[PDB]
């Protein structure tokens, strides 16, 4: 769907900012995003608990699909 296509492009952007890790860290968000937007992401991204998880790992994929994608499923 069009919403999924947009969300995937956002996911791809976060993935680059995360250096191709499957999650992103708060320090990477603060490094790359405007402070208000970094804080929003730090507060609202769900924790990443998949393979390779670490304390503080943030699930940018789930966050992006909820915000821009086909979220009502």
């Amino acid at each position: 769907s069009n919403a999924t296509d947009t969300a995937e492009q956002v996911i791809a952007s976060f993935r680059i900012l995360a250096s191709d890790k499957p999650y992103i860290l708060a320090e990477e968000l603060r490094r790359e995003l405007p402070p208000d937007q970094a804080q929003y992401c730090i507060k609202r991204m769900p924790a990443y608990s998949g393979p390779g998880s670490v304390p503080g790992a943030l699930d940018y994929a789930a966050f992006s699909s909820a915000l821009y994608g086909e979220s009502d499923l």
């Binding site: 947009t6 492009q9 956002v10 952007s13 680059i16 995003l33 937007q37 992401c41 915000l67 821009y68």
Partner: peptide, 20 residues
């Protein structure tokens, strides 16, 4: 409105600030 404005700004940051 608040969420709509915030997510539009984030979309600009994520898609329209780097040459990705």
């Amino acid at each position: 409105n608040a969420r709509r404005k915030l997510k539009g700004a984030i979309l600009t940051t994520m898609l329209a600030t780097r040459n990705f």
